[PDB]
Symmetry: C8
Subunit: 123 residues, 8 copies
């Protein structure tokens, strides 16, 4: 299949929301390929809408998945290394799926020379 | 369990508050699967509010837990690597669960050229960037 | 036990102050569980007060503990790796227990293009 | 193939859009070598515009691919190290292919001395920095 | 030793000034335990002031010590890893003991779009954030 | 050879553009040495021009090279370590060859205390 | 060689310009020891100016050298680790030799709360910080 | 010895300038101990002067030392690890000995949302 289908568009959003990679999604029988989905993502606002939301939902699912990957890692060198890679990939990706929620968090206390006020000279 | 059940939702919040992760909670007897919990969250504001509070408590619980995971790590290479992964995952997650409390902390002493004042020159716009 | 007790609240602050994790604290006979303590932390300002101070005191204790963990590490691969993890966990936690004191420290010399003045155009 | 051929250029854009890297594409049958592609880019605006669009699509494709590379890594030390290298290279590249979407994300809570307001003192210039 | 004893406190300050850590100092003959030292600090301003000075001196001493720990490390894997841990711990601690002297140092050349001036557009508040 | 030659200057830019290190370039028969090239880079604006452009072109070539180095690494510990070093060196260098294009990318959401407005007091 | 000798100083500048490090240069036949070179630098402005130029050239030379060190690394664990150390040392040094050219490069897209404008509230000073 | 001596103060500055750690300096026969030197550093401006300069000179010496440590490292795992630690310690220390010269260097291109102008609202 490779034609626009609202019912598969929905079906797509559901699997994504559950955390499943789009690759592992389209790889399903009767489903549009990645390329087609990205094509639709440029010809269906009604889709781009259900996709952005599904992406934030997918992130929330992945957030819980990282605890399981870390905690249930097989205590073998290569397996722990693989688990670390799976977790690091997800952490990095979550920040891009929902920046406001999963991006880095820093509090910067801004002070001037020697802890005094910030000194500025203007021209 | 597919239908929204307040009593089970309440239990979920209590377990999360104590530091347990959602996927682990959903494996307990009589608990809805994760997909179902997210669905409940999506359609029940009462649960969302209580879950947000549970998330704050969960972070405070994990903050104490990371000391235990590190200190009690079996002194075996792979076991220490796994303990490190479990701690790093929690550290990262804590900052997102409560950014104000658990985000990074930096004090930046801001100075200018050669340790003097910060030198700023303002000029009229040279291009149409408005 | 699981009722409010000012005497155990104090007892709690003491162990914390010495650097002991709350987990290893409540784990003591007759002591309230973590959950209860966090509950109290929302029903006793008189407690929230003695707890915030105890947390800064606990940090000061942990600060000295990291030198001992590093310097007395058994010179074996896994043991040194464990010692590093114990130290890294404490360093990260100290910044959160007392941000002004244990957070990162940076001095930024701010200059403009080519070392000249910072150039700004406003609209 | 040395002469600019729109049909081959179009194919290149489609392959890149799907996530394939340029050097790998140039190894396919009938494809121009990399140097030639860069030359085509240099002298054909039509190709440059379509290639820029293909780059955006390529990044979206690699973003999904990194999950697969990590999750399907053979659990062997060297194989995991290679998977990690393949993922780190893609992460770095994604930020450059689409900075807005894939660059780092940070929220900075800015406060001043002791958690109060940011203290700023302005003074007349003390040196000729204009 | 539980009662506050100025002479012992003075000794503690001298030892710390030379670079020794508090827990190691407290293991010496006749020294109060760490908990006791913190208690003394809490209730004797004279000791707190002298201890703060001792902390500055301690940092200057550790700054020289890190070169020695690195340079004299036994060339054995675990021994080098331990030396690295001892040095990293000291580096981190130095910045906190004397932020002005030992914090990170960065020079940021600040420029605007395309290397030109920093472009700023000011607008009236669009939301009630005051 | 060690005299100014526009034809070798061009020849130089070509190899660079293809991604080849200047070292591996001058190392070619009849070609000026590195030192001489850097000398020319201070006596031929017509050269400094064709060189800056060639450097940005070289970066674009290297950008594609890193995917090949990573993906085709021999799955052996030392070989993967070498591949990682080759890639890391190139990533670092690309940012310097074309800063606007290959430098780090960060989006900073700037907010004030507790997520409110940034509080500033001036004197 | 202890006395300042322009011809030897000139040679030093040429060697450094080509990428050689000072300690290695000082091991060559007839060269002054490092301490002596620093002494010459201290008291001869002519040498300092030429040495500063040589430093810029040295950095441009090392920039090309790092590709070679990485690409030609013997594929042996310790040899690759040493190559990595040699490259990391040069990267760090390059930024200091020519900060403008070799320092880190970052583009920061600055936005405010929720992706909107940066919200700033100014207030009268509440403490004597002038 | 443990009395103020201008001649040993000078002797001190010389060794430091050559890059030698103060520890390895005082450890010399007839020389004041570290503690005493730090004491003098608070009772002799004439000393604090010759010391700050010596520290910047020491940094310049150490800067050249790191190339030698890296390039001449014995190609053995532990020896390379030790060499890396010696170099990392020196890099970190150089930034503190001369911040303006050896501190980190970053050029930040500051832009606003979507690459447009930086948007600011004031109250």
């Amino acid at each position: 299949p490779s034609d626009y289908m609202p019912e598969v568009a929905d079906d797509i959003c559901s699997l994504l929301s559950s955390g499943e990679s789009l690759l592992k999604v389209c790889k399903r029988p009767g489903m549009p390929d990645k390329s087609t989905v990205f094509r639709w993502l440029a010809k269906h606002e009604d889709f781009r809408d259900k996709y952005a939301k599904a992406t934030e939902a997918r992130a929330d699912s992945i957030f819980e998945e990282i605890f399981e990957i870390a905690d249930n890692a097989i205590p073998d060198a290569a397996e722990v290394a693989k688990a670390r890679l799976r977790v690091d990939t997800r952490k990095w990706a979550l920040a891009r799926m929902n920046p406001r929620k999963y991006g880095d968090k820093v509090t910067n206390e801004l002070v001037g020379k020697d802890g005094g006020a910030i000194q500025i000279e203007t021209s």
